Amino acid sequence: DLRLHLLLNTSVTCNDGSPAGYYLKESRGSRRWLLFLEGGWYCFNRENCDSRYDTMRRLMSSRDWPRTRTGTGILSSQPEENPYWWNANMVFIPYCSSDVWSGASSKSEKNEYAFMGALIIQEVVRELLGRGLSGAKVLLLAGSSAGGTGVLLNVDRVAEQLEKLGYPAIQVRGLADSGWFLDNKQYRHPTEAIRRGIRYWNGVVPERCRRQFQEGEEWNCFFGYKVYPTLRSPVFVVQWLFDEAQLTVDNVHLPVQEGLRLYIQNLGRELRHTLKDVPASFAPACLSHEIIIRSHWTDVQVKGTSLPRALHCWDRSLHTPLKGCPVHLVDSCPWPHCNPSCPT
Numbered sequence: 001d002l003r004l005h006l007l008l009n010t011s012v013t014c015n016d017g018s019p020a021g022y023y024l025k026e027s028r029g030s031r032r033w034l035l036f037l038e039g040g041w042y043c044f045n046r047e048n049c050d051s052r053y054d055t056m057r058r059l060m061s062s063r064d065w066p067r068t069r070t071g072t073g074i075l076s077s078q079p080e081e082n083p084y085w086w087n088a089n090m091v092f093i094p095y096c097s098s099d100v101w102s103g104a105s106s107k108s109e110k111n112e113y114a115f116m117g118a119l120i121i122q123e124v125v126r127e128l129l130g131r132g133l134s135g136a137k138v139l140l141l142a143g144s145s146a147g148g149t150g151v152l153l154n155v156d157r158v159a160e161q162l163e164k165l166g167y168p169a170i171q172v173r174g175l176a177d178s179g180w181f182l183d184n185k186q187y188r189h190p191t192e193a194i195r196r197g198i199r200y201w202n203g204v205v206p207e208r209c210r211r212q213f214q215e216g217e218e219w220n221c222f223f224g225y226k227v228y229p230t231l232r233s234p235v236f237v238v239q240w241l242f243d244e245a246q247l248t249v250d251n252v253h254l255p256v257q258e259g260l261r262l263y264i265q266n267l268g269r270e271l272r273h274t275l276k277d278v279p280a281s282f283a284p285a286c287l288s289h290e291i292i293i294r295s296h297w298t299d300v301q302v303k304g305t306s307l308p309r310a311l312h313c314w315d316r317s318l319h320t321p322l323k324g325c326p327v328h329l330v331d332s333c334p335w336p337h338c339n340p341s342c343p344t
């Protein structure tokens with residue numbers, strides 16, 4: 001079990017002003033640390049944030065947090081469930097800022113809600129350094145769905161933070177799961193919500209990406225294929241070719257006729273194209289969403305290689321290609337579940 005710690009700096013808060021926090025399970029025997037970012041959509045104005053506070057309050061407040069949590073998937077300490085890092089120090093950071101982990105604005109007299117996602121990550125890292133992280137050799141920042149996008153937005157800031165604090169020996173890396181989206185046409189009549197959210201949250205994006213797209217076009221950096229080339233920390237990308245959250249924003253809900261068949265096939269081809277210059281990636285041809293913290297994450301394979309194996313090969317590569325231990329795994333067949341190992 002992972003144990004809850006509320007942030008000692010109570011000014012770094014969830015949406016409603018309650019303190020943010022993290023769940024931790026230590027492993028004194030390891031110098032590897034895994035920090036995982038929870039997902040769960042977002043809210044972008046007063047009215048729909050008010051709605052989210054009524055029926056999704058745990059994503060906006062720490063008031064009702066359970067006092068511990070169970071680690072699953074890549075957060076499991078059992079070798080049978082987690083062949084990759086079962087012996088690592090485990091950290092689960094709850095998502096209570098509703099800002100895709102980008103915000104840096106406090107609750108105040110002008111702001112009904114606080115959006116502090118980027119600052120929550122910074123403060124968790126700082127408080128963990130007095131608690132074991134100062135001796136780490138690798139810090140892997142991971143996350144799923146909105147947390148996967150949060151990895152892309154924050155991994156280089158964590159690297160910069162550790163350098164400025166005096167810890168240049170810690171190798172910061174990222175693992176972005178199911179947060180690699182496309183700003184494509186919908187099947188029937190979404191990027192505007194991101195643009196409005198950024199101004200509502202005072203959201204921040206990586207500096208190298210911001211300099212490319214410049215004022216008021218910062219929404220571009222929320223899309224993986226645009227922000228990834230600007231990052232300097234090593235990042236491993238996991239993405240279903242037919243992601244269910246992507247299809248939902250595209251207004252696709254699953255007899256498929258020719259128009260829909262061509263749309264679905266073109267989406268898989270476009271996603272595959274955006275990953276050709278991404279050396280560390282895992283992209284199976286399945287209709288699903290999220291992967292790395294479910295208990296049976298070991299079952300899916302691309303070209304005969306599991307995701308835990310591909311991540312271990314990634315570790316080895318960062319000590320050119322390795323014999324029988326690949327890191328770039330993208331299916332080429334064109335329809336959902338043409339890979340026999342897709343989840344049911």
Ligand SMILES: COC(=O)c1ccccc1Oc1ccc(N)cc1
Nearest residue numbers: 041146149181182183184190191222
């Ligand atoms: C849950 O996370 C998101 O909603 C998200 C994150 C980053 C970028 C986009 C996002 O939603 C989308 C907006 C528009 C289109 N076309 C696709 C996806």
Ligand SMILES: *[C@@H]1O[C@H](CO)[C@@H](O)[C@H](O)[C@H]1NC(C)=O
Nearest residue numbers: 008009010011012119122123
């Ligand atoms: C708490 O965090 C905020 C935001 O990062 C910072 O401005 C403040 O100085 C911190 N408080 C202390 C006591 O360090």
